Design a protein around this motif. Structure first.
Motif, PDB file in Angstrom:
ATOM      1  N   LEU C  56       0.834  -1.198   0.000  1.00  0.00           N
ATOM      2  CA  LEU C  56       0.000   0.000   0.000  1.00  0.00           C
ATOM      3  C   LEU C  56       0.870   1.251   0.000  1.00  0.00           C
ATOM      4  O   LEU C  56       1.706   1.424   0.894  1.00  0.00           O
ATOM      5  CB  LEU C  56      -0.929   0.013   1.210  1.00  0.00           C
ATOM      6  CG  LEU C  56      -1.728   1.310   1.245  1.00  0.00           C
ATOM      7  CD1 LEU C  56      -2.603   1.362   0.023  1.00  0.00           C
ATOM      8  CD2 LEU C  56      -2.555   1.439   2.508  1.00  0.00           C
ATOM      9  N   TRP C  57       0.657   2.132  -0.981  1.00  0.00           N
ATOM     10  CA  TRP C  57       1.446   3.353  -1.118  1.00  0.00           C
ATOM     11  C   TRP C  57       0.516   4.516  -1.415  1.00  0.00           C
ATOM     12  O   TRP C  57      -0.286   4.448  -2.349  1.00  0.00           O
ATOM     13  CB  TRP C  57       2.494   3.223  -2.234  1.00  0.00           C
ATOM     14  CG  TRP C  57       3.355   4.448  -2.437  1.00  0.00           C
ATOM     15  CD1 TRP C  57       4.315   4.928  -1.592  1.00  0.00           C
ATOM     16  CD2 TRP C  57       3.348   5.326  -3.569  1.00  0.00           C
ATOM     17  NE1 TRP C  57       4.895   6.053  -2.121  1.00  0.00           N
ATOM     18  CE2 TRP C  57       4.320   6.319  -3.335  1.00  0.00           C
ATOM     19  CE3 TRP C  57       2.610   5.375  -4.754  1.00  0.00           C
ATOM     20  CZ2 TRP C  57       4.571   7.345  -4.241  1.00  0.00           C
ATOM     21  CZ3 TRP C  57       2.863   6.397  -5.655  1.00  0.00           C
ATOM     22  CH2 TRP C  57       3.836   7.365  -5.393  1.00  0.00           C
ATOM     23  N   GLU C  58       0.626   5.580  -0.630  1.00  0.00           N
ATOM     24  CA  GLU C  58      -0.139   6.797  -0.846  1.00  0.00           C
ATOM     25  C   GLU C  58       0.797   7.912  -1.287  1.00  0.00           C
ATOM     26  O   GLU C  58       1.963   7.955  -0.879  1.00  0.00           O
ATOM     27  CB  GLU C  58      -0.893   7.208   0.420  1.00  0.00           C
ATOM     28  CG  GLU C  58      -2.027   6.271   0.789  1.00  0.00           C
ATOM     29  CD  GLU C  58      -2.741   6.680   2.063  1.00  0.00           C
ATOM     30  OE1 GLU C  58      -2.194   7.507   2.821  1.00  0.00           O
ATOM     31  OE2 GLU C  58      -3.852   6.171   2.306  1.00  0.00           O
ATOM     32  N   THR C  59       0.295   8.800  -2.142  1.00  0.00           N
ATOM     33  CA  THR C  59       1.068   9.976  -2.512  1.00  0.00           C
ATOM     34  C   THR C  59       0.152  11.186  -2.612  1.00  0.00           C
ATOM     35  O   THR C  59      -1.053  11.067  -2.874  1.00  0.00           O
ATOM     36  CB  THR C  59       1.847   9.781  -3.826  1.00  0.00           C
ATOM     37  OG1 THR C  59       2.728  10.896  -4.030  1.00  0.00           O
ATOM     38  CG2 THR C  59       0.901   9.650  -5.009  1.00  0.00           C
ATOM     39  N   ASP C  60       0.748  12.352  -2.368  1.00  0.00           N
ATOM     40  CA  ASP C  60       0.055  13.634  -2.389  1.00  0.00           C
ATOM     41  C   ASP C  60       0.267  14.263  -3.759  1.00  0.00           C
ATOM     42  O   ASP C  60       1.388  14.661  -4.098  1.00  0.00           O
ATOM     43  CB  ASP C  60       0.575  14.549  -1.283  1.00  0.00           C
ATOM     44  CG  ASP C  60       0.200  14.070   0.108  1.00  0.00           C
ATOM     45  OD1 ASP C  60      -0.912  13.531   0.274  1.00  0.00           O
ATOM     46  OD2 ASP C  60       1.013  14.244   1.042  1.00  0.00           O
ATOM     47  N   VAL C  61      -0.803  14.345  -4.547  1.00  0.00           N
ATOM     48  CA  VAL C  61      -0.757  14.943  -5.875  1.00  0.00           C
ATOM     49  C   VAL C  61      -1.925  15.909  -5.986  1.00  0.00           C
ATOM     50  O   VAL C  61      -2.969  15.706  -5.357  1.00  0.00           O
ATOM     51  CB  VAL C  61      -0.803  13.870  -6.988  1.00  0.00           C
ATOM     52  CG1 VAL C  61      -0.876  14.507  -8.377  1.00  0.00           C
ATOM     53  CG2 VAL C  61       0.417  12.962  -6.895  1.00  0.00           C
ATOM     54  N   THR C  62      -1.729  16.994  -6.723  1.00  0.00           N
ATOM     55  CA  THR C  62      -2.834  17.891  -7.024  1.00  0.00           C
ATOM     56  C   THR C  62      -3.667  17.299  -8.161  1.00  0.00           C
ATOM     57  O   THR C  62      -3.127  16.951  -9.218  1.00  0.00           O
ATOM     58  CB  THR C  62      -2.297  19.278  -7.375  1.00  0.00           C
ATOM     59  OG1 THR C  62      -1.360  19.171  -8.451  1.00  0.00           O
ATOM     60  CG2 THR C  62      -1.594  19.896  -6.164  1.00  0.00           C
ATOM     61  N   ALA C  71      -4.337   6.767  -3.190  1.00  0.00           N
ATOM     62  CA  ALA C  71      -3.779   5.494  -2.773  1.00  0.00           C
ATOM     63  C   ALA C  71      -3.486   4.595  -3.972  1.00  0.00           C
ATOM     64  O   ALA C  71      -4.002   4.791  -5.075  1.00  0.00           O
ATOM     65  CB  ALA C  71      -4.734   4.787  -1.809  1.00  0.00           C
ATOM     66  N   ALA C  72      -2.636   3.600  -3.739  1.00  0.00           N
ATOM     67  CA  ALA C  72      -2.285   2.619  -4.758  1.00  0.00           C
ATOM     68  C   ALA C  72      -1.955   1.313  -4.051  1.00  0.00           C
ATOM     69  O   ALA C  72      -1.037   1.278  -3.225  1.00  0.00           O
ATOM     70  CB  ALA C  72      -1.101   3.102  -5.593  1.00  0.00           C
ATOM     71  N   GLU C  73      -2.698   0.252  -4.370  1.00  0.00           N
ATOM     72  CA  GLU C  73      -2.614  -1.018  -3.663  1.00  0.00           C
ATOM     73  C   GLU C  73      -2.388  -2.139  -4.666  1.00  0.00           C
ATOM     74  O   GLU C  73      -3.175  -2.310  -5.604  1.00  0.00           O
ATOM     75  CB  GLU C  73      -3.888  -1.281  -2.842  1.00  0.00           C
ATOM     76  CG  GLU C  73      -3.854  -2.559  -2.004  1.00  0.00           C
ATOM     77  CD  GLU C  73      -5.149  -2.818  -1.239  1.00  0.00           C
ATOM     78  OE1 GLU C  73      -6.081  -1.985  -1.316  1.00  0.00           O
ATOM     79  OE2 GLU C  73      -5.234  -3.862  -0.558  1.00  0.00           O
ATOM     80  N   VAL C  74      -1.313  -2.899  -4.462  1.00  0.00           N
ATOM     81  CA  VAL C  74      -1.000  -4.076  -5.272  1.00  0.00           C
ATOM     82  C   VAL C  74      -1.022  -5.267  -4.324  1.00  0.00           C
ATOM     83  O   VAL C  74      -0.189  -5.356  -3.413  1.00  0.00           O
ATOM     84  CB  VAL C  74       0.355  -3.950  -5.991  1.00  0.00           C
ATOM     85  CG1 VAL C  74       0.676  -5.213  -6.784  1.00  0.00           C
ATOM     86  CG2 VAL C  74       0.367  -2.744  -6.909  1.00  0.00           C
ATOM     87  N   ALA C  75      -1.983  -6.172  -4.509  1.00  0.00           N
ATOM     88  CA  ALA C  75      -2.165  -7.298  -3.602  1.00  0.00           C
ATOM     89  C   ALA C  75      -1.908  -8.613  -4.324  1.00  0.00           C
ATOM     90  O   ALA C  75      -2.512  -8.885  -5.366  1.00  0.00           O
ATOM     91  CB  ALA C  75      -3.570  -7.295  -3.006  1.00  0.00           C
TER      92      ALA C  75
ATOM     93  N   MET D  78      -4.412  -5.115  -8.687  1.00  0.00           N
ATOM     94  CA  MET D  78      -3.947  -3.740  -8.635  1.00  0.00           C
ATOM     95  C   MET D  78      -5.138  -2.822  -8.496  1.00  0.00           C
ATOM     96  O   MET D  78      -6.046  -2.850  -9.335  1.00  0.00           O
ATOM     97  CB  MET D  78      -3.179  -3.382  -9.894  1.00  0.00           C
ATOM     98  CG  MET D  78      -1.923  -4.135  -9.981  1.00  0.00           C
ATOM     99  SD  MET D  78      -0.886  -3.585 -11.313  1.00  0.00           S
ATOM    100  CE  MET D  78       0.458  -4.728 -11.050  1.00  0.00           C
ATOM    101  N   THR D  79      -5.125  -2.007  -7.452  1.00  0.00           N
ATOM    102  CA  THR D  79      -6.135  -0.988  -7.244  1.00  0.00           C
ATOM    103  C   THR D  79      -5.413   0.339  -7.081  1.00  0.00           C
ATOM    104  O   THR D  79      -4.687   0.535  -6.100  1.00  0.00           O
ATOM    105  CB  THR D  79      -6.983  -1.312  -6.019  1.00  0.00           C
ATOM    106  OG1 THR D  79      -7.659  -2.555  -6.220  1.00  0.00           O
ATOM    107  CG2 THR D  79      -7.993  -0.216  -5.800  1.00  0.00           C
ATOM    108  N   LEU D  80      -5.617   1.251  -8.032  1.00  0.00           N
ATOM    109  CA  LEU D  80      -4.828   2.475  -8.131  1.00  0.00           C
ATOM    110  C   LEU D  80      -5.754   3.684  -8.219  1.00  0.00           C
ATOM    111  O   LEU D  80      -6.659   3.726  -9.065  1.00  0.00           O
ATOM    112  CB  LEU D  80      -3.907   2.426  -9.346  1.00  0.00           C
ATOM    113  CG  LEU D  80      -3.116   1.120  -9.522  1.00  0.00           C
ATOM    114  CD1 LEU D  80      -2.304   1.151 -10.803  1.00  0.00           C
ATOM    115  CD2 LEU D  80      -2.224   0.868  -8.325  1.00  0.00           C
ATOM    116  N   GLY D  81      -5.521   4.680  -7.357  1.00  0.00           N
ATOM    117  CA  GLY D  81      -6.288   5.903  -7.401  1.00  0.00           C
ATOM    118  C   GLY D  81      -5.750   6.852  -8.445  1.00  0.00           C
ATOM    119  O   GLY D  81      -4.705   6.631  -9.059  1.00  0.00           O
TER     120      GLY D  81
END
Lengths: 113, 113, 113, 113, 113, 113
Positions: C56-62, C71-75, D78-81
RNA sequence: AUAUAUAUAUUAUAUAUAUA
């Protein structure tokens, strides 16, 4: 599926979805820049074959101070009776692209008959 | 009759019916060779303008040993959002004409996705 | 708890919550960068052990002019019948990572079959 | 169909069914060795695109004295915002494959938290 | 488009539609000369795989003094049980091709049991 | 009935049942090795004639340690409009048998489109 | 208890992740 890639000048389009070919530069969440191809439909009733190639483009423009993503779709629909050649098609298309310069397009887009 | 005449290379199209321009050579009993323009439709509901330019061509060809008059129609339908230029439209159309050569046209007309 | 820490290249993940391993740098208000492990479940009915390792990786983007955290989740989910080795599983995983380069991934995210 | 073939090391996978790519060698009665791709789904509610690439491998092993065919499935989801790149995804996948060696995998399959 | 092209002697067939491959010479208005492949259907209920390869050919021939376009379709349907090899299939097909010479073909087409 | 015998290389098939020709070696309780011919059907509605020649083969193979008799059927179905020659038929059939080698058959039997 | 997502079988079965 059937085309490995579609090249137009410098731009290269890779197939993504069935019938869909998007620019290699454009990411998945980037504005859409693509080509839709649905073709080959033929009924013995009409005797005519129908196909369609659409060009779809999105751009981010600030309108009334608000940044909005605007769409633009140019769809070509071909209906060809038996006896017509693909060359005949390209000729008619070429005629249309020669006929449509930005002058006549601006005039037709506001209502030119 | 917004346009007095449509010129494409040597070919010259005169207006006949509202939004209809046919080649000056042809007769009324002669096969059709023409351009239909109906454009300028705008609703502020979608903020989208819609216009259509169609190219219609008929030819007398022998098919399977029998003389037949067949029709061929290439119709362009433009759907543009706010802030798209007629220049953007000619760019997209030029992209489509460059993309559709007779090889790909035939592949697509036989069913190409 | 069963892994004291998870080293991946330069980055080091320490356990915070049961089955959670987050990056050692991040503060609590920082975006989440973590690994969720939960596995070992076996049901006699199917004879299949099942396990999962999420990233699970989150990033701050406008986005649309508003600064937003996305958010971005690879399971990865492993379902293995009797007689499979963990090496079989690492082989299949390696196959998938070799397979998924950014180009193919963009294609699949845009609708790839 | 959107991928003509998938090469992984020595092995080459050709498409058989929509979203299925199996090894070119295998016959129909042979154990299954395949890749299942289905992706591109986007719901406006969550603003998250979701995609999946599964790897399926069967092998014939004697279990409890009976020759039986057992399966092994490793599925990446893959679940990506909005605002994630396919490169972000390949980075996370590479992280997970570096992380999962056979030792850690055996541990996790035996109940690893 | 599992097969990029089908080569038979000098003749080369390109893919057009899903499971359709037509000769590269022909046009879309030209008579059809093609191969339809739809295969791989398996149910464990019967343990039988079923596949079909069809050859479709049209020719403009004068019949009873009138020009007519006629169709000719030779369709192979394979139904194989568990433990039958593709080699077994090519053997049986080769047997059939050796058996069907024009003499027997004509006798059978006029009603031969 | 209409054919006294069907010879293919060394193998000779004797007529047994109406439409049925089985190998001379094979006994009545032995695995079936035969040819079915039903042909000559013609309706003025379609203008087309239909015929069918099937090759049927059975072999005893031990699968999962159990000896089972497996079947294999390759059926040819011909649909020929008036104006088509038996020679045209043998040509199309020959094209198909050349096209189907064990490579492409193994690939089509697991799903090749 | 709610929400989201994947894979198997002809609506059923199996599995993962987020929120209370």
């Amino acid at each position: 599926s059937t085309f490995s890639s579609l090249v137009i000048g410098s731009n290269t389009f890779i197939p993504t979805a069935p019938g869909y070919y998007s620019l290699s530069t454009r990411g998945f969440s980037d504005p859409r820049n693509q080509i839709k191809i649905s073709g080959g439909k033929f009924n013995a009733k009409t005797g005519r074959v129908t196909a369609a190639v659409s060009r779809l483009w999105e751009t981010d423009v600030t309108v009334a101070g608000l940044p909005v993503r605007s769409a633009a779709e140019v769809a070509i629909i071909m209906t060809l009776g038996r006896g017509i050649t693909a060359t005949n098609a390209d000729v008619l298309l070429s005629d249309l692209n020669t006929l449509l310069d930005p002058a006549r397009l601006d005039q037709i887009l506001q209502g030119g008959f």
